[PDB]
Structure 1
Amino acid sequence: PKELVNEWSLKIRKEMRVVDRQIRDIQREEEKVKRSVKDAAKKGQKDVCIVLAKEMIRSRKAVSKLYASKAHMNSVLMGMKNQLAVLSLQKSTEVMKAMQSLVKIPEIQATMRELSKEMMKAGIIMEEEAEMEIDRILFEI
């Protein structure tokens, strides 16, 4: 199954773009929240700042989880590079676990699980102090 790899690669790579895109937006959005946060600071609106702040943390986590996804994707792409050399299809216990952590990202969430079948077939398988992070970013901006 050399034919499969080439397509899968492409699919995987295509989701990678979605991932870059989604990040590009979240960041474009943080540019803005940053400004608001400042404005609200200058006008002494504490509650607007705290709130927007939670918006910011939420973003950072969002983006991070995304870059983590990009990694997982590359692990899987690598596994594809490999599958080419492994004289057939061997059960790369690597591209197993990555594609198990990948079927849990909203946007790529759907497809992945379907690629996971195509593969599994005849081949491979207290944040209570996060009330301190906000107070941090406020300061950090």
Structure 2
Amino acid sequence: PKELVNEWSLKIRKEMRVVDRQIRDIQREEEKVKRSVKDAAKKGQKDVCIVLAKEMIRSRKAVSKLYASKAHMNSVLMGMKNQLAVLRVAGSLQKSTEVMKAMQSLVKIPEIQATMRELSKEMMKAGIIEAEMEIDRILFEI
């Protein structure tokens, strides 16, 4: 039907489980690296420390960019929520500007981008990606 929404929610929600997992793993790694940095410091190995430290910055930045993604995705889920409404009201989808720039800053995250490119399209074709007709359009619940 017009339950594309419910499918896309599920996928988005799916991709968010992955992001959670990715972030849960990196953090578990930072746990260890932090201990390494401690030992290395105690044994006075300056250079092992400097390197590891860099490992951490890289870690933090990685996680950050992940949460960025989770947010962009959540932005899309919300838009999906809203779509149901724009329907429950009239019965069409509306080119949301919101679910368009989010679904733009997401096809750019490293790993996941193949699905996101594929969803962006399905979305573009249901006609929510890329009034005086609406004032007429809306008059369709008559």
Shared fold (TM-score, shorter chain, > 0.5)? yes
Q: 1:60 to 1:139 in 2, by over 3 A?
A: farther
- Going from structure 1 to structure 2, the CA distance change for 1:140 and 1:22 (only over 3 Å counts) comes to farther
- Cα 1:134–1:90 change in 2 (3 A) is closer
Report the number of matched residues: 138
**Cα distance in 2 for residues equivalent to 1:138 and 1:44:** 76
Higher helix share: 1
TM-score calculated relative to the size of structure 2: 0.86
Cα distance change on mapping 1:132 and 1:39 into 2, 3 Å? farther
Instruction: Find the structure with the greater CA-based Rg.
Output: 2
Following superposition, the deviation at residue 137 of structure 1 comes to 57
Q: In 2, are the aligned partners of 1:103 and 1:112 still within 8 Å (CA)? A: yes
Moved over 4 A (4+): 129-141
Residues 53, 134 of structure 1: 8 Å contact kept:
no
3-state secondary structure, aligned to 2:139: helix
1:107 Cα deviation (Å)?
A: 2.5
1:134: how far off?
58
Q: Which runs of 5+ in 2 are unaligned?
A: none
Name the Cα RMSD after superposition: 16.7
Provide the rounded CA distance (Å) in 1 between the counterparts of 2:94 and 2:136.
50
Q: Distance in 2 between matches of 1:136 and 1:3?
A: 21
Q: Identity over the aligned pairs, expressed in percent?
A: 100
Q: Report the alpha carbon displacement of residue 104 of structure 1 after superposing the two structures with TM.
A: 1.4
Larger RCO, structure (CA 8 Å, separation 6 or more): 1
CA displacement 1:90-139 (0-9 Å, x = unmatched): 000000000000011222222101100000113211xxx99999999999
User: For 1:13-63, what per-residue CA distance to the aligned partner results, in whole angstroms no more than 9, with x for missing partners?
Assistant: 000000000000000000000000000000010010000000000000000
Per-residue deviation at 1:8?
Answer: 0.3
In structure 1, the gaps of 5 or more residues are: none
Is the CA contact (8 Å cut-off) linking 1:57 and 1:134 kept in structure 2? no
CA 138–92 in structure 1, closer or farther in 2 if over 3 Å, else same: closer
* 1:30–1:130 distance in 2 versus 1, CA, 3 Å: farther
